[PDB]
Every structure is written in structure tokens, then in C-alpha cells.
Amino acid sequence: MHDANRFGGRTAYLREIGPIDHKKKGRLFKRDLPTLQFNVDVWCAQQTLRKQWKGRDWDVVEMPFEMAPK
Amino acid sequence: EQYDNLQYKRYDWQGWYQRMVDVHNRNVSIKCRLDDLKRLDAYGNPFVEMQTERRLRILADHRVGMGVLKLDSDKYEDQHDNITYGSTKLSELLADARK
Amino acid sequence: WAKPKKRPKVGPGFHEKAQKWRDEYLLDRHRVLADSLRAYVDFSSTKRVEPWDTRFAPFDRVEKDGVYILTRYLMDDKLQLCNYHHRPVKRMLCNVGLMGPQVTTTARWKPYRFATNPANTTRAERTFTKDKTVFTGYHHD
Amino acid sequence: SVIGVFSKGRATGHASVMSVLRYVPRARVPWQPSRFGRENLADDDMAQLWGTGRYRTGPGNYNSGYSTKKTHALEDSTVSIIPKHELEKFMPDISLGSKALVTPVSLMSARNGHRVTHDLIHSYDPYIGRLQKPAVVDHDNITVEDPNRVGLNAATLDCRSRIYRWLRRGPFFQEDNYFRRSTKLQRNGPVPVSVHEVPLMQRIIRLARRGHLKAACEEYRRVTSVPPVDVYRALTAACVPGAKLADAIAIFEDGHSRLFY
Amino acid sequence: SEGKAMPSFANEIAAFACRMAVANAITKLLPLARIPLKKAGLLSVDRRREPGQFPGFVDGKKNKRKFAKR
Amino acid sequence: RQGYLPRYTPWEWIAIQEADQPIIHETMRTDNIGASYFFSLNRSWRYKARPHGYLRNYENEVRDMLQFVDGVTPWKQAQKIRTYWEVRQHHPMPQFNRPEVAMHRNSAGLLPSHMWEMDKKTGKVRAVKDSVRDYQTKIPVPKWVQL
Amino acid sequence: LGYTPINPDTSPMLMYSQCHWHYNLPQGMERPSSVNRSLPAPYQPHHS
Amino acid sequence: MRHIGQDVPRRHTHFVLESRLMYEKSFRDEWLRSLCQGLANVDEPLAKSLSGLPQQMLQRKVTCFSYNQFGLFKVPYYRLANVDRYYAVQGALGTREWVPYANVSSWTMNKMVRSGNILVHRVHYKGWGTDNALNQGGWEHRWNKVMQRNALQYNRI
Amino acid sequence: MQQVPGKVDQTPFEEDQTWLMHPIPVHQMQQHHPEKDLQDLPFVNHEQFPRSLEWTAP
Amino acid sequence: APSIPRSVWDPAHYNENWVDSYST
Amino acid sequence: TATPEKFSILGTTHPKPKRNGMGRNNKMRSKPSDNVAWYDKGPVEWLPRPVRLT
Amino acid sequence: GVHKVGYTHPHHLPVPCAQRWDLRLARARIFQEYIEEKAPGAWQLEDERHMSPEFNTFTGYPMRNLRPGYGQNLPEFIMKKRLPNNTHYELFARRDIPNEDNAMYGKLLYDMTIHGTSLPSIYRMHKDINKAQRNDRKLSGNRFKVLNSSGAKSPPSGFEAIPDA
Amino acid sequence: IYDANVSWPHVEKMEPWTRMAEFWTSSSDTSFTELEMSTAHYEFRKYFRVVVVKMPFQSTEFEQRMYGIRHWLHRQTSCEFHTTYRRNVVHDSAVFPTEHDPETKPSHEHHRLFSFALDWQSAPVDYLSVELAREGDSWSSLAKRLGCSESELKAANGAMEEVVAGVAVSVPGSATRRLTSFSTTPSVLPLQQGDGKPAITSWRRAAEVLGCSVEELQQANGAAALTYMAAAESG
Amino acid sequence: SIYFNLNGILIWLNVLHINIILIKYAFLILLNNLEYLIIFK
Amino acid sequence: LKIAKSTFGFYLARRGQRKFPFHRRPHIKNTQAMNLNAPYFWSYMTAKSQSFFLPEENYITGDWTGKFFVSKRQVYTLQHATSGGKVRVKSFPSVFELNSPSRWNVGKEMNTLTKPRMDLIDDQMLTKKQRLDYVKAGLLPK
Amino acid sequence: NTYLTRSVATPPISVIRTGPKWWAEPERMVKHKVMYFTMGIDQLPLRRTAVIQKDLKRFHMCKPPPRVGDATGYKRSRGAQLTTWYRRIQYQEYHLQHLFVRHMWGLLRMYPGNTTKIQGKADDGYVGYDSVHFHRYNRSPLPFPAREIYERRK
RNA sequence: UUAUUAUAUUUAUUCAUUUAAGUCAACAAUAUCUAUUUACUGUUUUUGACAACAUGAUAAGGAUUAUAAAUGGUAUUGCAAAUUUUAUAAUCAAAACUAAUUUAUUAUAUUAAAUUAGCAUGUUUAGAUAAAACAAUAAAUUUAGAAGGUAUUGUUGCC
């Protein structure tokens, strides 16, 4: 599940290693899904945002209208 | 404009449920097709050309879509007020797009 | 219904065992704090075992060659200053950018509690036997 | 045998009338003829029920800080009150008095009409909070204990019928009552102009005549009482130079039939 | 993709939906191509349905909760 | 009695129903004057143009709040409210870095070592001395605080 | 079936019983109620 | 009181009245308090009208005010008590036990449907529901879609 | 994203190694949003007025 | 504009094409 | 402060046990399991281990 | 790379033109908005689960801001918080009341017009009748508990109650 | 009805509203699986149909036929109206002038939080429409300082046939050089002679000399307000 | 009060069912829980 | 409840081991109030920012006769530790006071100060049944 | 191998039984195909197994052939010997796939997971960076760091 | 074992939470012909829905009636309509486990804002044991149809 080779290793933010005592040890937010799910939605969005911004061969440059490309 | 004709029509809740259903409809979607503004003016100057309306769109980024400046005034719940305040923010936008 | 049955009174004079116990426990709270805080800090000042996993490339390459060159020359003093903790070095190493993106994708790194072992941690028995008196969340040493 | 929540009672009718009015029969409630509301209680017991009902802030509760209980029982053990001196050592006193509770009139619309930020719900109508006199809410004399008992308390006897009137209040109830209760035309006929607010009105006629119209209007919103006629004479005078016809009428229709003509 | 749009259609349970969608398409174009198709089932539609969500089952699909005897 | 239920409300009952309830005077929607930009939205506090919704809407009212909190409040009283860091300035270890970023930045210089005592054999903190008596700090309340 | 009475304005078993309409029937208007315009009352308010 | 001619069928039915005042009190104190927390922790300049001391002195004034205020409502809505107007049943909102729309607990709602007193249309127990909006993204989607309707579709001004 | 001028500004990180290692918090506590905080949870979706989810205000 | 528009109560405004009810 | 020399009821409570079963219910003592890997049997260990070929 | 975004003032250019920031300024003036000085440039994360077609729940708008640290105690949040005034909670305040017939009117007013006098809720009736039937047949359970004891602990000058046998 | 080309008005469908309300049909404490396994989904629903009427002109007699539909609707069916009427709006440049930039361009420093509260007088900007003719100005000389046409100025002020120094001319609407109705550079009031040689020594004479409110004088002069009357502790 | 012929009345009081038939398929299936549950047809 | 530990046992039912949504568990049981993670000692169970103002319970709104105990959300300051007067926090069984003041307590709310689940349990408060269950547990052995 | 944490073993049939779920996962047998293909090794058992699954997957929907009473039982016996053959065919291939891969990692110098044996390079079980003191089966206290079996340079 | 049709069949297991009482009645303020009604005062005799007993009432639970659109039950599960005759126990902010009827996240990357979980590293290893046949993919080691009861809502029966 949280096998550290999942989600590009960023699953290490969500993993309670070892024979945890479910009552006293183990952070709460690591238990509920939607928080785990909302988090992965963050990281998964980054790769898109990264890849969209790694292909920025163009650089944005403003220009007065008169001498812009036709 | 939505008035109630159900169990919410008559008794003591006649008011607050009516007040709700209107403050819940306080919007007045002011619209105008930009191409309409491309008329002459009483000073004789052309009102809005390609150089001007370009400024207009970028002045209201998500607002001006499908070539119609859409201004939804949701500030006040008195709907007539939203018309006055809405038209207020409206002319200001043309005041700058005419720069 | 298991009709709700009462619990008896709290017992005579237990309150005195309460005001006492909570207090002198909160006093013990200080030393375990004072101990663990030192353990955390003095951990941060010490050296760690190197966070990388030598088994995987590009850290299989012999110490003479490979990324060990830049590790030995361009940033050597720095990687000692950062005390070889697995949080700064992977950030320092990413800054030099002379190895590209191979920090995260290619280079595999030691697990967490394997990377908090201090330098000269020869016996692997060590990484599990860190002291129990200190409450640190396994940042201590 | 005989048991009750209260032993002593007091009437709600005056002496000079009751000696004669006692002859005409009173067609009481059929099922419960003995009518015992909050009004019939003595002002001693009146306070005690007034204290509780508020889960935290109500002085009835021991930990309300305003309580009169000197020593109280906590699970078979007693606990003593910390007088104000021994308390003011640690927790620094930050008190501004009653005048910190009364939020101004222009902010009624913000806070659902309510100016008074007491624990209870202070209602500008008399019938919700009527104890014996028609409930007139006071602003300066607001106190934690709320002596006049002009608040919609939670758990006092005869609260159901009182609360059900609150949840049935019109859209403008705290709003219109406060305007109608006060600020009514004078019995002799004229309009009740004079308050300590007159310097505000002078400013407008000091400001409107100069031609700073929007300055007048954006200040005129602060006006609360009925403006005297010399205000509008100055206001509408500023609409003349720029043909701001839309504004003069909006000024008119406000002072016309909405501010007592 | 008229149905619930998903990033990757890499599952046969979607392929058959496409294999059928192309099958019905050819028939409308060509009348007598319905004979060799219908004899091979590409026209016929599955009525299989993955079980809708339900809270009672722990995973939600077909495996109930636990119960231990005293 | 015989099933003839009207598919449509007959024209008669239309007029009879439609005449039992009065026209709202506002839905007439007549305006040849225009909009009053200076005055209309600033009308009297009774029938005022009441803003509603997100806090952005309460422009003309927030100004009154500030003018109100400015009014009743003496700065004298407000001085006593302490920020957290103002209070944590009196703690033995007021500020030390957390493990996410600047863990290595922490040093023994951050340790209030003189507060407690160390035992060389255990290498740990055996106990701590009393800090309330001997903490002489010129700012029990902070410097700019002047009651 | 208890002390809490049934709200006759929101209950189907009542509103869709035989003693009222059913949801199937043509559902038209039963009878026009000309009250305010046949015998109108004048405006005697309590608030002066 | 003290069970002397109690008119209601159940005593706890009264607590619904108190809870309704909480929403009423919350309407009373929210804008004022929320404005304070809006001014309390702003560390950047408030506005070019107020920077530096006029800010950090006022910042303590405004908070001191909401601290000076007496009995102000500082309860977040989820911490209140969900109770039914019918049977005064205590409900844990967000669970299956609290029916969201009619805002009555399961026990009260379950009874009302079988002993039909409310107009609901039954749907297969395993199904996602006849709706087509809820189907696509589950419970979270319909949660999103309404925010689009209530607030987002409004191209602001 | 038009950013304020004169402010030392940061280009989005192009290489992944820079993305993970920078200190970014993860959403530990409960989620909040200005609009739909009223609609308390994904489950309990309060509707002050039942309107068709495609009701477009004119 | 009377309540019952002239379309209904009139011979000359009769819709000859409007089929009766018991036919369809 | 000045941590009392003898603690009244901190240590004077009941003793706490340490779990001694390496697994479910804290009962499974160490014993050669089925999962034992016989490296001798053949060029691969028997039983085989989970092998992914990415 | 981390840089200093340049703002070449439109005047000192070869061919002048209103820079895009100037418009972004001139916009915020008209629609009063908040330009944050400390906004991060790297954080342009779009809500992909919503604003992308291939995803199941494509709503087209950015539903949630993917800023994880976003809370209600934040300043910028409270600027955009929706006041509970006239929302679901108002409706639940006035409609979700113990006796749903009381929201319509005070009951006494109803039993004043429709009936002739106020009648107690159905509970008090069942309370009342059952007292009578037992009291008509039996006795010895009648606990004379009244709200105010004065009427009982002190009967008036008249009213000598008939000795009940 | 559902085709606009053939029918008028033309009913437009709309997706019904559905709110699944699942709940535990059971009620017991000891067993939770009993509850969850006893879930049953009953839905509330409301079906909509939208009537779309397009009048080539706005007749109010027709609209009040419309808003009367709410009475005779079939049982248990409320309706809402979406009116959409053209409205003529005047963009009078006199109130909103399309003028040049301000010399000091506002910046992000003018758009922090609460900027709408403290940084911007709600549009439209106030402009002075009243201008006093100075000592010897002419009609072209006034039209000068107001940046307006003398002829427009002559038409604007009908009552002003001759200019008498000290009377205020009504600024024409088409003006381009009208002023922001306030002064920006601070001014101070010395206890220099003022009223006679005696200076200001109390709050009221403080107002009398400036001719403005004691209140608005206290508002700016905060320090002098917290101490005394006219800040009795002189220099 | 409109009417159209009956097919089967079904008095389902809490005591029992008494299901009479005069068979047809169906139309609207009326329902009354005033005091005694009955399913008209 | 099976054992009504207070007035709220007669009303609410355990409903099994019900799984509430996160952070919406109904009873605010801060049994994890004092869990000392020394690195996060200033961020755990505290104000997430260190520039917030102190909570209300550390301050006095109006003229109080006197609070029996100050609430547990109050934060401890030096004035608290130096004035030394009796400062009380509600807890079972009756109340807890900070008789022995220290500066290690300054800056942390009283939640993190008190120990909610007192290790010394009451063989007196628990009937022969509920004590027996502790005997099997080894928390209260025999 | 990027997977190194401790593992759990399942018998051959208990994996072979999953068929097209994981055992005959289409792309998986394409992986071990190329790997076999590129090594110059004939992919005879894989294509031998591939037809076994492809027929079973294709015919998993139908009924079993009608069980008419046959006192001889030859059909039931033939129904078994042909089955146990198929299992024995996949048994060989299942082991064969694990044979080469661990040996393959001997050629790419990829440290396999815990409790894993490469014929020559890690004769006994390799275990590095586990969750326990000792080699789980050989009771040898681990060395730190994880011991290496290949030579350092590439 | 009587002459349109298949159980042998994986995927799982350490899980807990609740607080510190308060119902004995109703009252237009603007623009419709004027009421100070402005500030509409009359003194006090009862004991069910409760902390208690107090009839009804809808669930969980698979085992032998679809081939051209359906796999969850009535006997009953806390708060419900005729049995009263000690007694306020209701959510409010900041709050303490003993509880059968519960997916907790297991090693590339890991705390951002209403307050939210530090000790249990030890061969995904005891005994017990959990849940599928539904848009998926396992179709056979095999089935109506004869049978007894001291019980008498019946094997947790009686003797």
C-alpha cells in the first residue's frame, strides 16, 4: 500500500513503520482516506505542473501592439 | 424573482422565508455585447475600437467571455441596489477601457 | 437495553492521590523533556551515517570516481557542516545540480531510521536499540 | 404532602385597581386556571433562574466567574472561589465596561440587527423580554447579571412561548422595532429633531453648501435620527450644479414618506 | 468517450465497450455485415455490472464485515 | 363525481384567482431618472442598502467597526494582551529549530545547560533546579509595554 | 401514531390518501377562492 | 418544571429550542468575531493607510475588543449538538445516523418513511442512486457541484 | 501568474528532485474552503434550496 | 387586454383546425 | 522544580507488562514458519520470493 | 531560477504601452480585490481533479485551492468566508423547531380563533384523563405537587374543602 | 412544446434534483455492523421544467399576468421566474471621466487586505461641480482653469450673465480640469492672530476660527484631543 | 368526490391482513393510514 | 452506555465501535494532550503560528466574583509561575492545582500540562466486574 | 530492483491459479518474454505456458463438459492427468522465471529483496536494511550498512 | 445417488473515544382618516415519559419459483399511542477510556493556519478466525423424488 516505491517515493510522508500500537502510536491524518487522497492529489498535480513547466521552450515577453507579430 | 406558493405562503414564516428567497437571489447579471459598444460618440470620437476593448477584456479577465461583458452584482440584497451598484462598477470599467 | 448501571463513587480521599500524582508527574515531565531535548539537540550537532545507499547507482561507483568526486571537492566542507543528516544533504546535493535529477529518480537513499544512525555505527543492532527514556519521535540518538 | 418549586408569590396587578377589579370574574385558562408565569415571581427567585440556563456564561453555574457560590462541591470534594485580587495576578484584566458591548447602530445590519452583545438575545420589542413592564432594552446599563431581565433567556419558566415568538419574528424585527420604539413624531405635532447628534447635521450643512456632495452623502449615512429640514435644503442644493437629477430624487424619496415627510 | 471519462482506457472492460461500439457502427454503415458479426457476439451487449457502492461491505463491493462469536 | 377533471384550469378561475392577490409595487420596474451613484446606496440607516455575503461586501460598515473599536477602547487596556512569543521569551529554551529544515542549524549554544544538571555516568539529565526564583529578567512584561 | 402530531402539509400518506388528491390524478385546481374580493375587510391596524 | 404539569411529551425535546438559538447567536456574533480574526493575525500591512505602529497597536485593540466582548459566540458549527425536533434523538452529523436534508436522525427518519409521513422515493439499496451527478464522482462530486451552483457560477464583481 | 514587481520571485521547479526536497507541508489537519465550509462534509451536503444542479442564474 | 382574451370567446377567432377533444 | 528525591506515587503504581508475543494477540512465539527460505534447494530459494521485473 | 520580476515602466520604453501589471493593478482597483505581496510564484498548482476533461469529475472551475496549509484562522480565508447569514443554518433555525406547528403561529392564537380557548398539547390530555380515571377509581397515590405551594400551604379564608371520604 | 421552431413558448427540460439520503434503518448500541449493514437509500426529488417565453418587447401588463401564475399552479408545485430585460444605461463621462493616469501610479501597497475599507472612496470619484470666480477672472479665464469651453461655460451657468468676483460658477458637466473635492497637502492653524490678537484657547473658539466642526477637528488632531480643550497646554 | 370502481380492499391493521379480491391488473393503488392501514385499488 | 460514568451515560448509545469522520469525533477526548515530542514541543497541541494572541481564558473580561478553576485551554506564563497563587484546572476526580511552579511550564497551554489518563487507577471506582477486566489486562494485576 | 523491503512467499499453484489476474497478466508475460528473448534464451516454456492460459482465458466462461455416468472414469482420470500436467508445465515456468531474474540481477548488479538468493553472487539469503536485528532465517546479526555482493565500479 | 447443467473456490485479522441541570401566557410602529395602546401589569393549590416503572410500531440475519431489464427478509432491533405516584439529569466550546459486534498509513521524496496523537524493529510467522459469486473472465469431486422424535413455536426440546 504505502510500499515506499509507490507514488514516486512521496508516500514516505504517509507511513507508520513497524508494529504500531493502533491506539497510542501512529498519526491520525495517516488513517483517514480523503486526507491521504487529497494529499496525493497535490503531488500528482505537481508532476503535471512540473511537466507543463519543463516544456516552457517559449518565454513570455510583452510588446506594444504596433510592432507585434502580424 | 421567486415568491412562494406552498406551505411557505401564508403564516408567520411568510416573511423570513420570503426574505431568504430574495437575499438568495440578490444577483443581477449585467450583460452587454462588446460589439454593440463599437458605435460613434456624441463627442464624435469612435467609442471602442480594437485597441480599447483589448484593454477591456484584460481589465475583467474571467468576466468578459463569449464576447459579452458579464457583470454579476451580488453585493446588496435589495435587488434594485445591485442594479445601481452593478451599473456603477460597470461604467467604471468602460471609463478605463476608453483610456 | 442493558440498562445503564452506575459506577460507584470515585472512592474516599482519592482526590489527594490525584492532585499529588498529576503534579509530581508533571515534575517528571521536566526531566524527560530536559533529557530528550538535549538528546535531540546534541543529535543535531553530531555526524550521521551517510544517507545515500551505496548499493544503487550513482553511489556504487568507486570513491575515487563518480559523484564522489564532487562530493569530495566541490562541497566537501559543506557536507560536513550540514552534519550529514538526510534532510539537508539531499537538499544541498540537489543545489549543486552537477549530477542532474539523479538525486531522486536514480539515487536510492537509506530508509529513515537507518539514516539517523550516527557516524561509526558499525553494528546493525544499533539502529533499533536507541534509548527509550527520551521522547523525540526517533530524531534523537 | 404539599410540594412546590416556589413557596412565595407576588402579584402582577396594582393595588389601587385590584380592590375594585376583583369583582368582574376572570375567564382564566380552562385546563390550568392557576396561571404562574415569570411575572408572578419575586425578584429574589427571579435572579436565581435567571442565572442558570446559560451553559457557560450564566452566573448560576459555579465556574461562570460571576457566581455567588463561595465554596462548591466537585465530586464529593469542596472547592473555594478565587477572589478577584488573587485572580488578577495571573490573568491580566482587559475590561472596557458595558460600552464595549453596544455595537453601533450602523452595524445592526452586520450582526442581525443586534447592537447588544450580551449572552442573551436582547429584543427591541417588549413582548419577548417582558418581565412585568413592557421590555425596554437599555444600552448603557447592560450588565453581566442583566438586572432588568430584558433578554430571551434559555431555560427560565415561560420560555417556550417566548422563544417561539423569536423564531417567528419578521424579517425586520430588531430593525424596525428599534426605529419605531424611539424616533417617533412629537405629540405636539413637530418632528423630534434635537439630540446630541446635531453637530453631525451642522457638518453636513457645513459640508453640503461647499459643494462636496459625495462627502456629505458618504457622511450622511452615519446620521441616525431624523434629519431636520435644513439638511436636505443643503443636500439637494449640491445636486443643482451637475444636473445630478438621479441623486436629488433618491434624496427626496428617502426623506419623503420614509423619514416622516 | 461518452461515459465517465477516465485518464487511461487500458482495461478490457473498456475495450469490449469499444469493440461493441465499433461493431454496431459497421452494421449501420453496411447492412449485411450484421450476419457474420451477430454469429460471433460482437454485437450482443453484456449486462454485467460492477456492484454499486454500499457501506455495509467493508471494502464496499462484496466482502462483509467481521463478527466474532463470544 | 363523473371523472371530468379539467386538463387545464378554466379561464374563469384564472381571473378569479389572479384577482385575489395584489401586484407587488416593486416588480413594476420603471426608471427614467437613472441610478444615484452618490446617494442611493448611502440612504438612511433604517432602509439602507444593506451589504450581505462575504466580508468584502461590508465596506461602509467595517469602517464603522474600526471607528467603533477605536472609540471605546483605551490603548492602556489593550496593552496586556501578549503574543505567544512574548510569553515564550521567558521559557528556558524559547526558540530552537524543528527537524523539517534547520535541524542541523541547532547547536549546543541553544541549550540552556545551566538550568538543569548532568550526570556523567548516565550522560542524561537527572533533575532540574528552580527557575522561578532566580529568573531576573528586566522584561517580565515586554519593554514597549507601559501600563 | 403518537403524541407528536402529523404535519398535514407535508405527509404523503395524508396528502396522497383518498381524503385528498392522489399524485396520479389530473391534479388541476379544485376551486377558486375569491375571498378578498367578494367580502373584503377594511384596514384597522393596531400599530397607530 | 421539575415534572409539574409538563406539557411536552418528552423533556429533552426542549433542548432543540436552545440549539436553535446557537445558530441565532452565531448569526449575531459571527461577522464581528470573524472580522477580528481577520484583523487579529494579519502580519503584512493592513493597508497603506495603516502600517507599522497604527497597525500593531490596533491589532491588539481589535482582538482586545472581541476579548472584551461578553459571552461572544466562539463555537465552530461542527461542535454543536444535532438533535431532532421530533423525538429529541441525539445525532452524530456526517455519519449514516443523521439524515442530512430533513435534518432528522436515522431512528426518527426510519420510522417516518416506513410509517410514511415524508415524501421520499426509494432506490435500490446497492445503487449509487438514480441521480446522474452523484454517480460520476461519488459523494465528493455532488459536494463540489453545489458550490459551483451556490457561489462559483457567479462571475463576481 | 502576474506577480507583484520588484519582489524576488521563483520560477516553478522544473526538475522533480527540487519539488520533493523543498519544505512543503502536507494536509494533516481537516480541510477547509471559504465557499463550501457551509456544506460541512462531502457526505452531508446542505442545500438551503433544492434546485437543479444545472440551474443557471440568468 | 381583458382577462379572457378574444381568442377564446369568439366566432371569428375560432381555430377551425383545432380538433375536438374526444377525437384524438 | 527540584524533582522530589523520592517520588510518591509515580513509580508506586501497578507494573506495566511488555508485549512478548511476536505477532497477533501478542502470543506467537518465535518458531520456524512456512515462510522460511531454503536457500540450499536449487539455484533459487524455495519458496521463491516476490520478484518484480520492471 | 529565482529572480526579480522586472517592471519596465511603460514610459521609458522605445514604443510605450501599458504593461500587463498596470492592467492587473487597474483591475484590482475597479473590483476591489487583494493583491498579495508574498504570493509564491512556484505555486501555480491547478486543481487537476476538476479542471481537466479526462478526469471523471470535470467541473471546469477550480473547486479547492491545493494549498494544504489553508485554514479558517487565515486572514485571506476570512476575507472570502461566507457569513452564515441567510443560509442553510437560518432555514434550520426557524424550520427545525420542536413543535413544527408553532413556527406557523402561536398555538394559543390558533385555539383562540379556531377553537374557543387554549387547549393543552395532546400529551397533557393523556396526562389529564388518566389522572381522572385513576383518581375516580383509586386514591392514595395523589401527590399534591403544584408549581407554587402558597395556594395549598395556606388555603384562603373561605374554601373549606369537603371532607373527601 | 419542446421545439422552439414549432411552439411558443417552448418548454425546456432541466435535470431533476436528487439528494440521496442514506441512513441506518436499525437502531442499537452493541453492534455497529448491524447498523451499517442495515443501510437503506431513500431519495428526495424535485423535477423541473423551464418555460422559455421571448417577447419582442417588454409589456408590464403581460408580466403581471405572469407573476399571477403562482396562484393557480397544480398542487404542490412552486415556480420561479427568470426575467431578462434590456435596460438602457447612461455612461455619463461627467461622473466617470476617462482621464489620464495618476502621476503617482498606485501600487500593490494600495491593495493589501481591507484596502477596500481604507484605501478607496467607493466609485464614482467625487468631483467639484462648484467653482468660485476669482478676483478678476473672465468667462474665457474661468473656462481656462476649469479646462472647459467658454461657450459651454456660458450655457452651463444660465443665471451668470456677469461675473461678480466671489460667487461660485457651476462647473460644466463636460469639464476636463475639475478638481478632486479636497486638498492633499496638510495645513496647520497657528495661534497667530485669527480672531483679534487673542489666540485660540478652548475647543469652541478652536472651531470658530477654522469654521469647522469640533469633532472633525479632534479626528485629525488626535494628540490635542486627548489632552485638553484646544490643548490648553500651550507651547 | 370522484370515483372509479374498486378491485380489492386490504385492511392491514396491526392485527392482521384481510385481502379481498375482485381481480383485475391495476390502476392507482390508494392508501390510507388514518388509523387502520387500507390499500384500495 | 453499559456503565453510566456521568449523566450522559443514560442518553447516548455506544453504537458499537463506530467510525466517526476525522476530527468530528463527538466527545473532545484530548487523551493525547500530553504526548511529548521534544522536537515539536512548541508546535504540538499549540497555536500553529507563534504570533497569535493568547486565548481568551488567560484573560479577564469583566468584574468577576471569582472562577473556581481557570479552564484548561489557558496557557501558562511566567506571571503564572512567579505569582505562585493557586491555579486550578478541572479534571477527574475533582480538580488539579499547580502547587509546584516551574518555568518549563511557561508557554504551553494547560492541556499539555495536565495528564488526562492518570496512571493510578481506582480499584474503588470500578465495580468487581470492571476491576476484574483490569486484572486480566495486567494494568491492575493480582 | 527498487523493491527491497521484506516479502511474503506464496506457493506456485497459489499464484498460477490467479491466471490472467496476475500470473498470466498480459504485459507481465510480455516482460519475461523480452527478457528471455534478449538473453538469446529460447522462450519455449513461456510460449508453452502462454497457450495454456490463452485457451483457459478464452474458455473460462463455458460449462464443464456434461458429466455423464462413466463407470470406467477414464474421462475423469484424463480430466485429471491433463490438468496436473498443465500445473506441472506452469510449475516449471514459474520457477524458470524466478531462476533467470535473480541470476539476471547478477549481471546488472541489482540487489534483490530480503531473503533472496542469487546462485553465485549471494549464495545464501541476502538481507540489507530490514526491520530486525538479525538475518531473519540464519540468525546472523546484520552488518551496517547493508552488505554488498557486487564490485563497486559500474 | 432415478432418466434445461458447476461450490473447492482467493483477497483478509491487534481499532478505542461523549460533557459539569433549569419551559407552567399573548401583544402593526413610515407612505390607508388621528386611540399616547409611550412604557395594553390582576398576588401566588398540585404528583407519569422523568435520574423510574408506564402495552403496541418498520431492522440485522443468505440456503432450493426469471432467459430476452431486481440478490437482502416481520415478529423486533434504546428514545414511539391508554399500567404513572421519590427525585430537573441533554450538546453549551477546550473534556478524564475498558469498552464483543472495528480496513490503520508497513521503508525514493512525509505536519501550512479553529486544537488534534512517539514506541509495538524483530522470518505480511500461535490458536482461533473474515467475507465474493452481481461488467466482467474460477461453469462439476455429482442434484428434486422413500423414511424417525418421549418434543408439542418442538434438540439450547424433554428424560
PDB file of C-alpha atoms in Angstrom, chain D residues 213 237-245, chain M residues 92 94-95 129-130 170-173 178:
ATOM      1  CA  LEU D 213     -21.799  66.396  -2.289  1.00  0.00           C
ATOM      2  CA  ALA D 237     -28.590  72.199  -3.247  1.00  0.00           C
ATOM      3  CA  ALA D 238     -25.444  70.279  -4.198  1.00  0.00           C
ATOM      4  CA  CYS D 239     -27.314  68.322  -6.881  1.00  0.00           C
ATOM      5  CA  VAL D 240     -28.079  71.533  -8.783  1.00  0.00           C
ATOM      6  CA  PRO D 241     -24.616  72.302 -10.261  1.00  0.00           C
ATOM      7  CA  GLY D 242     -24.012  68.986 -12.036  1.00  0.00           C
ATOM      8  CA  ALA D 243     -27.600  68.072 -13.026  1.00  0.00           C
ATOM      9  CA  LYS D 244     -27.321  65.016 -10.764  1.00  0.00           C
ATOM     10  CA  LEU D 245     -31.073  64.589 -11.046  1.00  0.00           C
TER      11      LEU D 245
ATOM     12  CA  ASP M  92     -22.010  59.861 -18.474  1.00  0.00           C
ATOM     13  CA  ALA M  94     -19.034  63.773 -16.387  1.00  0.00           C
ATOM     14  CA  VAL M  95     -19.193  61.463 -13.373  1.00  0.00           C
ATOM     15  CA  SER M 129     -19.146  70.898  -9.703  1.00  0.00           C
ATOM     16  CA  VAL M 130     -18.981  74.309  -7.995  1.00  0.00           C
ATOM     17  CA  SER M 170     -21.465  75.887 -11.661  1.00  0.00           C
ATOM     18  CA  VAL M 171     -18.785  73.753 -13.318  1.00  0.00           C
ATOM     19  CA  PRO M 172     -19.981  72.382 -16.680  1.00  0.00           C
ATOM     20  CA  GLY M 173     -20.501  68.657 -16.985  1.00  0.00           C
ATOM     21  CA  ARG M 178     -12.303  69.793 -12.463  1.00  0.00           C
TER      22      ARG M 178
END
